[PDB]
Design a protein around this nucleic acid. Structure first.
Lengths: 102, 171, 229, 454, 74
RNA sequence: UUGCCGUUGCUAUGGC
RNA sequence: GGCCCAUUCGGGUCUUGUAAUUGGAAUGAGUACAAUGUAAAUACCUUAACGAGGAACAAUUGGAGGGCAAGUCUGGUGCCAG
């Protein structure tokens, strides 16, 4: 059973966003399991599962803890506006390939 | 590290024989490394004695040196004098390593059983599994050397030999 | 590759953002990317500070001015629409840009040092300031280094602060950059080290230039609010 | 003078480091961080709460309604209580039984509701340290802890288990073993208004759990003897005390760092301090804690000390040397075995082998001005801490509790200026860890409740 | 149909003497030349083994009434 | 008011 | 029976050996699920599955000394010396 801890929750009205640091705790598990972590984050906060996102995962030595960077949006459309395209390729729906020449 | 002056005299060979046999060392490089940095330590403490009382260097670097030597654990709490740093020697330094300490605490039956426990990761000081034998445990990490909870000598699930024998005896 | 005024942490990058041209000089301003991104941290990178600049939250000096390297110099009131953010940024005592938070009736104006008064063309009196607001028709008694108060809805001067012996002055320049206290001494020389001198906690003395100092109010009553500690 | 030269050179050093009040005093980085402080959320859990309930001298003391409800369980060990924002209490014994009480009928003795008794039936069929997932206690339940929300009680003891029982039925919902051989739990404390448990296990270990997720958060290491007591408040800090290493540590649990506080009273300097014009001495073992607020706490020792400690001083702020008396010396008909009283008196050596009572229970009411101490002197003591927070002082005694006090805690009633509390104290005739206790002087295994007023 | 190479062409240990299993580990060699050394030390000195084990059976090896193994001065 | 047992109260105590 | 000293005769000492049998535990190199990381990929970190008896899953380098044949060569005062 994974365990979740949010810390230092601030609000960004300019980016319509709420951001925090994510202490993810998995004793006798491998690692963070980021999609399941987005599920757990989207249910501890409000619904917006295609508007919650995590990117900066570092597991400490020997496992157990990992610190990530969590940012949760309202309004999935403006989340699609404000998130970068590589994270949208990683998690959500966007896929535009670069033209392979030279 | 650095090699000694006369590296092949018979007293030095019987010295290294007794040290490597009594502490389970692999070669001469363990003794030479820990003795090289002990040489730096007490070559510094010699100069701290050759300067006088109420010298700023002597006062501050002397109590700094004996307090971090006590916290490494080679020097006891009551001898807070600077001539005991000169009386210090090499097996006082390599009694502090984790192989020696695992055997002395009795998690192993010899220093060689301690070395293979450490390199097979059954030993964790504090939180982290330590896996190299020459670790120099400190006076606060002296009492949390125990079996790792990820290991069958702790309480964990038994290893591949035990579970394969259990499965074949279940067949 | 950075100046000292920006309060910029060294573990940031390699290329430092040159501000673009604008009202103030390069050496006495901070752009919006070093303002929003890495000082009060409304962004994390240049992409999203350009995103909120395209969204146009910033309202510096009452106009939007959507630009990354827009050189906000002295006391340009940065206005942000969400959470009614009104920021007057002044100098602290050790050279950086202390960004004080103010309210709406204070961000409805700014003040500016007058640089020169001209009979430019066609009988029109004339006044410029550090953001270059060429506003029409002040009184004839505007000397150099006095202080106009800009309207910030239209551009007109509303109040005027006369530079004389016994006025509350702000020093931006040289080895006195960012001090307040304005009275131990007055000494106008004839070409250099000419000033009004500024006190300290023990009322110490200081030397600067005329152009490197400009008035903000009176002995106890500036209508600018100031931060404290 | 070498220490004078050390102090002088350290002063010059700090002056030089400063080298490398005006009307303008504003610092840009401080006010920027204060803007981020105005921007952030969650001013809820992390209150550095000071002492806001100053009521020590206010309430009555000497005329409490003291009911010592004796129960038929050998050596009660712990007491857990609960208040929402009807009140239940919990006791547990060395006879492997948990017992639920109702306590909300305030003017009278508590009411038994439900047993939950483990026994020899719950010994595991393996003797293997990770299949310890049975549903009951087979050895020596040492501590209970009720949830701050009241869904669960969680208990554990020398069978190295944490069994979490539901409240409404006293049923084991989940079993979490501590996965090693010496992993006996000795103290449990929820952080206040939460679902996070801090257990202190004799592996020099502190385990943390989230109970409603059935998960373990963090194991944190660092004491040097067994962690005999634990204490927590609404902050994610914690305060533990290991027994014989004579240090109390407090843990920033997310950072996994600590502040240590050693003791350090010596009878040489103490008897010299009295010799400037006396039976007091050094320290055995720091035993019990309770965090009074988020800047101070109090420790109960083995030589009867009660000490008051701040968050900003290694050495303790205040001591109180003898807090429950010195024990009655062993009789001349039970020391020697000679015939004459002169030699049997010579076998007492005067005053050299008088040992003090050791405080085996201490409870600070959270953020309040008053704490309660208990041992087998027969009389609980109530102390209030002075409003400048640098001393405490004995208010009164509660003398209706014959036996060892294995647990003290209080139950609140009344509003902001008029209040009444019932002090529960588990009373046994045997210490909560080992036996060690002779001269059982009229003790009974009961619950000493007192009703204090005003 | 793949004529794979074998161990003597692969590792190329051409014509070596017979060597020692205890020499294949640097740690076990010093474990077994220290056991040899402290078995030789019982020959030269008399080693304190740990005192009287059980009942005092006797000297178990002989008593010489002619030999005196004590260091005379000057 | 309890594992027994005694005084019990018409509730408090004290021996294992 | 091993070991130690010593130019010699000899002396000193003591549980020491053996390609003897045998037992269950341990895991690491390797083979590999992944997830994390990252524009992406590698790597670090975390990590289920398999992985040892010649543990052949086969570390070297250099030195000191022998011993053997229906063998070969040389010398010369048999059977020897080299």
């Amino acid at each position: 059973a994974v365990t979740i801890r949010t810390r230092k929750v601030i609000s960004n009205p300019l980016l319509a966003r709420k951001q925090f640091v994510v202490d993810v705790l998995h004793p006798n598990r491998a690692n963070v399991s980021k999609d399941e972590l987005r599920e757990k984050l989207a249910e501890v906060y409000k619904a917006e599962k295609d508007a919650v996102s995590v990117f900066g995962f570092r597991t400490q030595f020997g496992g157990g803890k990992s610190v990530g960077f969590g940012l949760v949006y309202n309004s999935v459309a403006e989340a699609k506006k404000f998130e970068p395209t590589y994270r949208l390729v990683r998690y959500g729906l966007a896929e535009k390939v670069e033209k392979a020449s030279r | 590290y650095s090699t000694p002056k006369r590296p092949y005299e018979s007293s030095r060979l019987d010295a290294e024989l007794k040290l490597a046999g009594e502490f389970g060392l692999k070669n001469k490089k363990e003794i030479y490394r820990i003795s090289f940095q002990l040489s730096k330590i007490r070559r510094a403490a010699r100069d701290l004695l050759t300067r006088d009382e109420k010298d700023p260097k002597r006062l501050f670097e002397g109590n700094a040196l004996i307090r971090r030597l006590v916290r490494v654990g080679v020097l006891s709490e009551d001898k807070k004098k600077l001539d005991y740093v000169l009386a210090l020697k090499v097996e006082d330094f390599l009694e502090r390593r984790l192989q020696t300490q695992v055997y002395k605490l009795g998690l192993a039956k010899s220093v060689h059983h301690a070395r293979v426990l450490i390199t097979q990761r059954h030993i964790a000081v504090g939180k982290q599994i330590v896996n190299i034998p020459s670790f120099m445990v400190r006076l606060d990490s002296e009492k949390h050397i125990d079996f790792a909870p990820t290991s069958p000598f702790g309480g964990a699930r038994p290893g591949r030999v035990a579970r394969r024998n259990a499965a074949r005896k279940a067949e | 590759a950075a100046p000292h005024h920006w309060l910029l942490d060294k573990l940031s990058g390699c290329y430092a953002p040159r501000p673009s041209a604008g009202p103030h000089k390069l050496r006495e301003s901070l752009p919006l990317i070093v303002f929003l991104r890495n000082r009060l941290k409304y962004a994390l990178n240049g992409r999203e500070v350009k995103a909120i600049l395209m969204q146009r939250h910033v309202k510096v000096d009452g106009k939007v001015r959507t630009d990354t390297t827009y050189p906000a110099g002295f006391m340009d009131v940065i206005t942000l629409d969400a959470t009614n953010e009104n920021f007057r940024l002044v100098y602290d005592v050790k050279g950086r840009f202390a960004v004080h938070r103010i309210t709406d009736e204070e961000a409805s104006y700014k003040l500016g040092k007058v640089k020169k008064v001209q009979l430019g063309k066609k009988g029109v009196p004339y006044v410029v300031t550090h953001d270059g607001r060429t506003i029409r028709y002040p009184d004839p008694n505007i000397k150099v280094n006095d202080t106009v108060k800009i309207d910030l809805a239209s551009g007109k001067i509303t109040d005027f602060i006369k530079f004389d012996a016994g006025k509350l002055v702000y020093v931006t320049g040289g080895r006195n950059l960012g001090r307040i206290g304005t009275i131990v001494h007055k000494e106008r020389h004839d070409g250099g080290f000419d000033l009004v001198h500024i006190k300290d906690s023990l009322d110490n003395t200081f030397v600067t230039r005329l152009n490197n100092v400009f008035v903000i109010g009176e002995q106890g009553k500036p209508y600018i609010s100031l931060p404290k500690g | 003078n070498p220490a004078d030269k050390r102090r002088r050179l350290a002063k010059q050093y700090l002056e030089n480091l400063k080298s490398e009040d005006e009307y303008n005093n504003f610092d840009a980085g401080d006010l920027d961080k204060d803007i981020i402080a105005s921007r952030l959320k969650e001013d809820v859990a992390e209150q550095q709460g000071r002492v806001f309930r100053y009521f020590g001298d206010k309430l009555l003391i000497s005329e409490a309604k003291q009911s010592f409800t004796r129960v038929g369980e050998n050596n009660l060990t712990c007491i857990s209580c609960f208040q929402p924002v009807r009140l239940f209490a919990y006791t547990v014994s060395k006879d492997l039984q948990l017992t639920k009480y109702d306590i909300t009928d305030f003017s009278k003795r508590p009411k038994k509701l439900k047993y939950a008794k483990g026994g020899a039936k719950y010994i595991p069929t393996s003797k293997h340290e990770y299949e310890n997932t049975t549903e009951g206690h087979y050895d020596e339940i040492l501590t209970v802890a009720a949830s701050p929300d009241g869904k669960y009680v969680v208990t554990g003891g020398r069978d190295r288990k944490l069994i979490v029982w539901s409240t409404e039925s006293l049923s084991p919902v989940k079993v979490i073993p501590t996965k090693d051989r010496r992993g006996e739990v000795l103290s449990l404390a929820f952080r206040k208004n939460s679902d996070q448990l801090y257990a202190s296990c004799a592996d020099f270990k502190i385990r943390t759990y989230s109970i409603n997720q059935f998960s373990q958060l963090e194991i944190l290491y660092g004491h040097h003897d067994i962690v005999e007591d634990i204490s927590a408040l609404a902050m994610e800090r914690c305060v533990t005390v290991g027994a014989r290493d004579r240090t109390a540590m407090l843990w920033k649990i997310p950072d996994e760092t600590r502040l240590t506080f050693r003791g350090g009273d010596e009878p040489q300097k103490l008897l010299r301090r009295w010799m400037k014009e006396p039976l007091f001495f050094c320290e055995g073992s720091i035993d019990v804690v309770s965090m009074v607020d988020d800047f101070h706490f109090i420790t109960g020792s083995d030589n009867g000390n009660i000490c008051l400690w701040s968050l900003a001083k290694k050495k303790p702020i205040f001591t109180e040397r003898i807090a429950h008396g010195i024990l009655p010396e062993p009789s001349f008909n039970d020391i020697s075995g000679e015939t004459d009283e002169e030699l049997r008196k010579r076998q007492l050596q005067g005053k050299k082998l008088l040992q003090p009572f050791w405080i085996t229970s201490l409870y600070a009411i959270p953020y309040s001005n008053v704490f309660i101490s208990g041992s087998w002197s027969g009389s609980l003591k109530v102390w209030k801490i002075s409003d400048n927070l640098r001393s405490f002082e004995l208010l009164g005694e509660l003398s209706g509790a014959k036996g060892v006090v294995t647990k003290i805690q209080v139950v609140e009633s009344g509003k902001h200026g008029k209040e009444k509390f019932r002090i529960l104290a588990s009373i046994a005739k045997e210490h909560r860890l080992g036996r060690w206790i002779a001269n059982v002087s009229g003790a009974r295994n009961g619950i000493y409740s007192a009703v204090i007023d005003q | 149909g793949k004529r794979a190479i074998n161990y003597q062409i692969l590792k190329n240990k051409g014509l070596t003497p017979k060597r020692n299993k205890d020499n294949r580990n640097s740690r076990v060699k010093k474990r077994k030349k220290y056991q040899k050394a402290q078995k030789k030390l019982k020959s030269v000195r008399a080693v304190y083994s740990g005192g009287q084990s059980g009942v005092y059976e006797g000297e178990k090896t002989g008593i010489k009434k002619g030999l005196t193994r004590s260091v005379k001065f000057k």
